Amino acid sequence: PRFLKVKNWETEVVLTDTLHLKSTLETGCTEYICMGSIMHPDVATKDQLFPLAKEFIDQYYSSIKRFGSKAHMERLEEVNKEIDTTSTYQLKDTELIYGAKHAWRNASRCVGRIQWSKLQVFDARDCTTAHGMFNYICNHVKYATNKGNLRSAITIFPQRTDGKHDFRVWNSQLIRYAGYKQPDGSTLGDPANVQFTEICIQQGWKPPRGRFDVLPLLLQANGNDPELFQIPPELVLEVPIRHPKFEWFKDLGLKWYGLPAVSNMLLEIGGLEFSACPFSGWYMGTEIGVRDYCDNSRYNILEEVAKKMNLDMRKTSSLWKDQALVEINIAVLYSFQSDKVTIVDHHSATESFIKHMENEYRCRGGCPADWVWIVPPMSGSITPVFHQEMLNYRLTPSFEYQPDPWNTHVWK
Amino acid sequence: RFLKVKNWETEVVLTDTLHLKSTLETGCTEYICMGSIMHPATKDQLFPLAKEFIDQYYSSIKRFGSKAHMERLEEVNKEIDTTSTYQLKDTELIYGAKHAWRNASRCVGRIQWSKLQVFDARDCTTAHGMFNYICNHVKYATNKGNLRSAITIFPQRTDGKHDFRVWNSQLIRYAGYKQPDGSTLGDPANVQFTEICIQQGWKPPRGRFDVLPLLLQANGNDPELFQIPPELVLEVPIRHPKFEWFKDLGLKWYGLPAVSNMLLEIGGLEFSACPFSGWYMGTEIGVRDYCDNSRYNILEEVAKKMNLDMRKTSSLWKDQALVEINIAVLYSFQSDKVTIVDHHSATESFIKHMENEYRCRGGCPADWVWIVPPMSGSITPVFHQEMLNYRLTPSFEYQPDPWNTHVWK
Numbered sequence: 001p002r003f004l005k006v007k008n009w010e011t012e013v014v015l016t017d018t019l020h021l022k023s024t025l026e027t028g029c030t031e032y033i034c035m036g037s038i039m040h041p042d043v044a045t046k047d048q049l050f051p052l053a054k055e056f057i058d059q060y061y062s063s064i065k066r067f068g069s070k071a072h073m074e075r076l077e078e079v080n081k082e083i084d085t086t087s088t089y090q091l092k093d094t095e096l097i098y099g100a101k102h103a104w105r106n107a108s109r110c111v112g113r114i115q116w117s118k119l120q121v122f123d124a125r126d127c128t129t130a131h132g133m134f135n136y137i138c139n140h141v142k143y144a145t146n147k148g149n150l151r152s153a154i155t156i157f158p159q160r161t162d163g164k165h166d167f168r169v170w171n172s173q174l175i176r177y178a179g180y181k182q183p184d185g186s187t188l189g190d191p192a193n194v195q196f197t198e199i200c201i202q203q204g205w206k207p208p209r210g211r212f213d214v215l216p217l218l219l220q221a222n223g224n225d226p227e228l229f230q231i232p233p234e235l236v237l238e239v240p241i242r243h244p245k246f247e248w249f250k251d252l253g254l255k256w257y258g259l260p261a262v263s264n265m266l267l268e269i270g271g272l273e274f275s276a277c278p279f280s281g282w283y284m285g286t287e288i289g290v291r292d293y294c295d296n297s298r299y300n301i302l303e304e305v306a307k308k309m310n311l312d313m314r315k316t317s318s319l320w321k322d323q324a325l326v327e328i329n330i331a332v333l334y335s336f337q338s339d340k341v342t343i344v345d346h347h348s349a350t351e352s353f354i355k356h357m358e359n360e361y362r363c364r365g366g367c368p369a370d371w372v373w374i375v376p377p378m379s380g381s382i383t384p385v386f387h388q389e390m391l392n393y394r395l396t397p398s399f400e401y402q403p404d405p406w407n408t409h410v411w412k
Numbered sequence: 413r414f415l416k417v418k419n420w421e422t423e424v425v426l427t428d429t430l431h432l433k434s435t436l437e438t439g440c441t442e443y444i445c446m447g448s449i450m451h452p453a454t455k456d457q458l459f460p461l462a463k464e465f466i467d468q469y470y471s472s473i474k475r476f477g478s479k480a481h482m483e484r485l486e487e488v489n490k491e492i493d494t495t496s497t498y499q500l501k502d503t504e505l506i507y508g509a510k511h512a513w514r515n516a517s518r519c520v521g522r523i524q525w526s527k528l529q530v531f532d533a534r535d536c537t538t539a540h541g542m543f544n545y546i547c548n549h550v551k552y553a554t555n556k557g558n559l560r561s562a563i564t565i566f567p568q569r570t571d572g573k574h575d576f577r578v579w580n581s582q583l584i585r586y587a588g589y590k591q592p593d594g595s596t597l598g599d600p601a602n603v604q605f606t607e608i609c610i611q612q613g614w615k616p617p618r619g620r621f622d623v624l625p626l627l628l629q630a631n632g633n634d635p636e637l638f639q640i641p642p643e644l645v646l647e648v649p650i651r652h653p654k655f656e657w658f659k660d661l662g663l664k665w666y667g668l669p670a671v672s673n674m675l676l677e678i679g680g681l682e683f684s685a686c687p688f689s690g691w692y693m694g695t696e697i698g699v700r701d702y703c704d705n706s707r708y709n710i711l712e713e714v715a716k717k718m719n720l721d722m723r724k725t726s727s728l729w730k731d732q733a734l735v736e737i738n739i740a741v742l743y744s745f746q747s748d749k750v751t752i753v754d755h756h757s758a759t760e761s762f763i764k765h766m767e768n769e770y771r772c773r774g775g776c777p778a779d780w781v782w783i784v785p786p787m788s789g790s791i792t793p794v795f796h797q798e799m800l801n802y803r804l805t806p807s808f809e810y811q812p813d814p815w816n817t818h819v820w821k
């Protein structure tokens with residue numbers, strides 16, 4: 001079965017996927033089970049690495065329309081000799097850039113991929129220490145932020161060698177707010193970040209103990225113990241959240257940071273593993289997790305918004321949760337737009353993704369897409385991705401999950 | 413292998429063993445997942461299918477290996493030998509029909525699966541008799557607004573040239589007419605079937621909420637038209653608890669969702685006509701796609717009457733009007749005492765249902781893509797619930813529309 005077809009049930013457009021033939025790794029599904037809603041369903045040896053590097057180099061020389069050329073054959077022989085004599089190899093700058101852009105292009109869960117070719121790639125493979133990691137990360141944050149006109153970027157630190165000298169960013173994102181578990185069980189700040197917050201304090205961080213404390217960077221170079229650094233506050237662009245109609249919404253005291261920069265994933269290119277590779281874009285409004293904050297000793301933001309809206313909160317069928325959720329998302333978009341900080345709403349983002357997906361089917365022969373993650377977390381059926389059938393499969397280069405470094409790190 | 417499913421809000425982990433019993437394919441492979449794709453016998457093949465079903469029936473009544481289990485297997489085997497098919501016992505039909513619902517991975521309403529009223533219509537021979545059985549189904553299931561789940565099962569497929577079919581997609585739906593300009597009077601989802609009914613002799617009233625006639629096919633014959641008696645069709649005028657102008661939109665909907673175009677498979681037997689009904693979850697009610705005027709959706713018109721800024725999508729006017737429409741649907745059914753469930757309560761019930769099924773059955777096949785409601789997904793408890801999807805039998809299946817296969821006479 002060389003071709004697979006997907007249908008859009010609103011428009012009746014049918015697209016034909018051949019790209020899936022290049023899929024490399026297992027999905028977790030079988031002919032008898034689907035694991036599509038499952039969150040996640042020793043270094044490479046010499047013999048394991050030869051074919052993975054050849055596949056990548058072949059793909060690279062095809063993309064630049066030099067497949068089979070003298071340069072292609074010479075590059076292949078060079079890589080083969082490096083693996084034979086050193087058990088690994090080094091990517092050229094061009095291949096690194098190509099590989100990072102294509103890991104984004106291949107990210108089946110990412111709705112923002114129409115932008116994939118504009119990624120700014122910062123080569124930090126000469127970095128040797130956590131201070132140098134901090135320098136690279138500050139420059140990335142400053143460049144990507146661009147005074148609110150956000151630019152997508154990735155910074156790539158040295159690849160894994162024996163697995164005992166890994167570079168890692170222990171933060172899950174470069175910018176996130178601390179959370180503090182109180183003795184009485186309540187949470188101050190962002191509840192998602194309580195474990196990592198406790199690690200930072202344990203490493204020596206003196207917490208301000210506020211609602212929106214930007215966490216320090218915890219940076220690990222060359223397998224050494226990680227080191228704490230404070231991001232300069234002038235580099236952290238933030239948006240106060242207010243509402244175009246509800247005067248009281250600003251009184252909730254909410255703000256969010258402008259730059260989503262995920263820093264705990266692994267970038268895999270040609271069998272090489274870049275365990276420190278923070279990448280950033282701009283937000284879709286629904287992602288901003290200000291909803292889980294506590295306004296007082298007992299109430300969510302969602303509950304507190306509904307209470308200030310004078311909604312009936314005794315029955316679920318009044319849809320007070322739905323009403324409040326819409327208004328919170330209105331406030332997020334209004335505030336970012338008012339402050340001229342790049343943000344995209346879920347209608348625009350999904351409409352762009354469908355245009356992206358069609359272009360990729362036409363020009364590339366397919367587009368791996370994970371419906372469970374592409375459909376936004378609200379108003380699903382009124383966005384164009386809901387009635388769009390998708391095929392999910394794993395192409396390389398790719399971004400991958402990796403274990404939390406505190407679970408594996410051997411402390412010096 | 414046992415497979416774990418995790419809820420990422422509660423951290424509850426359930427262990428799935430039931431998927432090891434599934435025998436039908438899902439469409440996915442090791443290299444490609446097709447979870448968002450909508451649609452991914454002979455004498456010689458029938459008895460293994462029948463044996464598998466008879467086995468699980470007698471296992472379910474804790475009489476596996478019993479004398480009656482063996483005799484029934486011997487009876488079914490002889491009957492396939494001599495007649496190329498077999499007939500289910502009344503008890504087996506009821507078990508089979510209930511477990512087809514129990515196994516419907518896309519249905520969020522399955523906490524109710526064992527309370528299903530099963531109507532045996534296997535003695536039916538004509539479209540007039542189908543009409544009678546269907547009228548009795550509608551009347552019983554409607555129950556003056558205290559809706560009750562029911563299925564009516566017509567005779568099984570024989571050689572494939574004598575199928576019983578309900579040509580309607582639901583027992584009760586509104587007509588939809590192609591307007592001279594291009595807009596739509598009535599339900600846009602039903603324009604094609606409406607044209608079929610008009611071609612078949614139906615005289616259309618050409619309003620916004622014309623209940624379609626039943627188009628009924630018995631024994632492979634040409635289908636016949638019938639008008640459901642209007643007093644059997646319970647309807648709810650849609651109004652809003654805050655917006656007094658909502659009732660001026662003139663919208664209404666019918667109370668009884670009764671899907672009639674799917675195929676029920678039990679023990680290798682195929683029941684091509686088997687309309688089943690329950691009650692609505694409010695988000696299902698497709699009143700959103702109606703046209704108020706010559707150019708505007710109900711969604712666009714509701715946003716207008718709400719005085720929202722409709723020039724930019726980031727004002728979220730679509731999301732705001734959608735919530736208000738769904739508030740009005742629920743308020744209206746509740747005000748008229750017609751059974752309805754909101755998507756918060758329904759998904760909460762389904763999580764409890766999963767817990768029950770993992771405890772007593774070792775798993776629950778679930779299709780996340782279809783279980784998560786079409787609005788406010790992540791603030792319902794199913795969003796963060798991992799699910800395993802697999803195909804068990806008895807099951808409800810899709811089948812082609814009869815007007816693509818039927819040869820007229």
Ligand code: HEM
Pocket residue numbers: 103104107109110111112113115119152153154279280281282283284287344349373399
């Ligand atoms: C430019 C604007 C971008 C937007 C609007 C965007 C949007 C999104 C959204 C909404 C998600 C799902 C979020 C969730 O479920 O919580 C996502 C996931 C993801 N994005 Fe993008 N994204 C952008 C840029 C990027 C870039 C620059 C990269 C990498 C170079 C990237 C890689 C990924 C990956 C790997 C995932 C999946 C993470 C996982 O599997 O856990 N994105 N994106």
Ligand code: HEM
Pocket residue numbers: 512513516518519520521522524528561562563688689690691692693696753758782808
């Ligand atoms: C009792 C109240 C019930 C509720 C609230 C309910 C709810 C739902 C919903 C919301 C869907 C998906 C809707 C959509 O995607 O448009 C669905 C699918 C389905 N339901 Fe239920 N349901 C109920 C009863 C039943 C009964 C009694 C049966 C059969 C005996 C049944 C069989 C199915 C099947 C087979 C599907 C999937 C159809 C397909 O795969 O295309 N449901 N249900």
Ligand SMILES: CCCOc1ccc(-c2ccc3c(C)cc(N)nc3c2)cc1CN
Pocket residue numbers: 260261262264265279280281282283284287
């Ligand atoms: C905790 C389970 C959810 O996992 C997730 C969920 C989302 C993303 C993610 C990654 C990159 C993004 C970029 C560059 C821009 C943007 N607007 N959004 C992003 C969202 C990562 C992970 C895993 N680190």
Ligand SMILES: CCCOc1ccc(-c2ccc3c(C)cc(N)nc3c2)cc1CN
Pocket residue numbers: 037038039192372373374420795796797798
């Ligand atoms: C270790 C991180 C814990 O946080 C987590 C953990 C898990 C999920 C989660 C789980 C299931 C999802 C499904 C089925 C679809 C989707 N589109 N997204 C999901 C996101 C989010 C968060 C963030 N609260």
Ligand SMILES: CCCOc1ccc(-c2ccc3c(C)cc(N)nc3c2)cc1CN
Pocket residue numbers: 669670671674688689690691692693696
């Ligand atoms: C048109 C594409 C989607 O297909 C669908 C979508 C939904 C259902 C369905 C079936 C039975 C239901 C019952 C008994 C109650 C209820 N409240 N809802 C139901 C919804 C069927 C089909 C197959 N036609």
Ligand SMILES: CCCOc1ccc(-c2ccc3c(C)cc(N)nc3c2)cc1CN
Pocket residue numbers: 009386387388389448449450601781782783
């Ligand atoms: C011939 C029937 C035409 O109507 C149709 C046809 C198709 C779908 C449809 C398509 C894809 C869906 C996905 C990926 C998830 C989900 N949860 N639901 C879906 C429903 C609905 C309708 C109802 N308008």
Ligand SMILES: [Zn+2]
Pocket residue numbers: 029033034035036440441444445446447
């Ligand atoms: Zn799958």
